[PDB]
Design a protein around this ligand. Structure first.
Ligand SMILES: CNC(=O)[C@H](Cc1ccccc1)NC(=O)[C@H](CC(C)C)[C@H](CSc1cccs1)C(=O)NO
Ligand SMILES: CNC(=O)[C@H](Cc1ccccc1)NC(=O)[C@H](CC(C)C)[C@H](CSc1cccs1)C(=O)NO
Ligand SMILES: [Ca+2]
Ligand SMILES: [Ca+2]
Ligand SMILES: [Ca+2]
Ligand SMILES: [Ca+2]
Ligand SMILES: [Ca+2]
Ligand SMILES: [Zn+2]
Ligand SMILES: [Zn+2]
Lengths: 259, 259
């Protein structure tokens, strides 16, 4: 009952170095096929207290072999642009705004790769996702090239393929583990809608030491090694079974076309 | 030297009550032609302390009389939908996702009106904007019908037409007055890029009393009666001259097509 998802990678490049190699792209696909099957070896990093909660999402990914017209494809498009940065406003997802149009969202997972991404207020970001239910025109994930794959332009600490794992988590209806409070809200007040992810104050960055306690969640602390936190690639290594329930409802519902 | 912006309002309705009247829509236009001209009678509410800073933005709005093909229009489209809520993912801006396609962004301000709006993570919202520079397909503003205009379905405390004023402020390149810090950041660290808006910690809600001091901006405090704060309709009544400058730069640059 493994769900196999066809992927198209849209490389959008301004300078030649940003037109990343097949090898770099393939290395990311390989990572997704580990993380989404619980075949990543660093799963051994999960605290013993949570070692029974680790999920095999039962999802695999392959670069599409047929394009939306039925013609053979490598599963990779490559589009030269004069645009120097893209934002969460989705300019990368339309040819008219210097990016590349989405392939049918009911048949493919669209991944756009570009050099520079910013939030609306100019914060540098590595990637962003569209949750299920949105318009097909902008469905998929976007990851910057220096945070994509495990070779080529990929740079530590984002050189282990986990930005894409995190964004595809969102694509499958998963929320940030800490609940996404706004600055005026109590840091312990919001939920990620998953019971087996401990309540958590804020995102964790970098390489935290276990345990990292917040919101009176001791002695075990934050599950900062979940892909839906903000830690360095080498530190995030698992989805929970509670998260798998959400992913499965997404696959059984809004993304049933992939079944 | 008044800039006159042609408007199209896309009413997207599921239940007939959401198919709002011409009068309700017209009442919103009337409000915009006041707020953006410093003609709102409640501008008198601004503490005299800042009377020197209150701006006439010199912008007016009209419902388009010609559609994108040059045929007569009322400047209002009405689209029936089976969709019961829209999100910040822009479903309302595409017919394919149960909404209505944008008119050319270089010639019209697109305003969508729907019954229920949510953020990505399910928070109820009254409206949202796209900032300049984004793809034309999604350019414009979205407001919920209960927060649109001053009659019909409009409900207090969002029955003075200020949601649209706030959103159109974003459309013209204005940022939240308090700087949009993330939960974990110093609340005094970010700027709205406007000198004459006092440095402000957090958004203000409801009906604060003057003064509301934050970030050592005493004795006058936060300019919480600015349209780009988060206070009730009845409490937001002004733009500043510094904001007028940013807006003029937007019309002189990315949105010069409207000149
Ligand atoms: C060098 N850049 C980073 O490490 C930034 C830091 C940051 C955090 C919040 C806001 C702005 C910047 N983080 C990201 O890129 C996130 C992805 C992780 C897994 C690397 C990314 C943030 S997207 C948002 C923009 C605005 C609000 S949330 C995300 O959650 N995608 O789904
Ligand atoms: C009944 N609901 C409300 O009053 C919500 C409350 C709220 C605030 C922040 C996040 C989620 C909900 N406020 C809005 O709808 C804002 C408009 C005001 C002027 C009325 C609206 C929030 S859009 C965002 C979604 C996520 C992050 S910011 C806005 O700034 N548009 O430009
Ligand atoms: Ca969008
Ligand atoms: Ca949880
Ligand atoms: Ca939290
Ligand atoms: Ca300011
Ligand atoms: Ca602030
Ligand atoms: Zn994320
Ligand atoms: Zn706003």
């Amino acid at each position: 009952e493994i769900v196999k998802i066809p992927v198209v990678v849209h490389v959008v490049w301004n300078e030649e170095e940003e037109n990343i190699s097949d090898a770099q792209i393939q290395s990311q696909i390989d990572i997704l096929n580990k993380d989404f099957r619980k075949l990543n070896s660093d799963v051994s990093q999960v605290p013993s207290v949570w070692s029974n909660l680790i999920a095999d999402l039962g999802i695999e990914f392959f670069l599409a072999t047929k394009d939306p017209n039925g013609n053979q494809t490598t599963g990779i498009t490559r589009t030269q642009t004069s645009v120097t940065f893209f934002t969460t406003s989705d300019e990368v997802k339309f040819a008219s705004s210097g990016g590349e149009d989405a392939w049918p969202a009911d048949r493919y997972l669209n991944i756009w790769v570009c050099h520079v991404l910013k939030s609306e207020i100019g914060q540098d970001i590595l990637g962003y996702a569209q949750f299920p239910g949105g318009p097909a025109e902008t469905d998929g994930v976007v990851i910057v090239d220096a945070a994509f794959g495990t070779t080529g332009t990929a740079l530590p600490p984002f050189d282990k393929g986990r930005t894409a794992t995190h964004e595809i988590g969102h694509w499958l209806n998963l929320y940030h583990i800490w609940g996404d409070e706004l600055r005026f809200e109590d840091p312990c007040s919001r939920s990620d809608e998953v019971d087996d992810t401990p309540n958590q104050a804020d995102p964790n960055f970098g390489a935290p030491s276990y345990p990292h306690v917040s919101c009176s969640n001791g002695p075990n602390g934050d599950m900062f090694m979940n892909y839906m936190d903000y830690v360095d690639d080498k530190c995030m290594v698992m989805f929970t079974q509670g998260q798998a329930t959400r992913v499965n409802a997404c696959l059984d519902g809004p993304r049933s076309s992939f079944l």
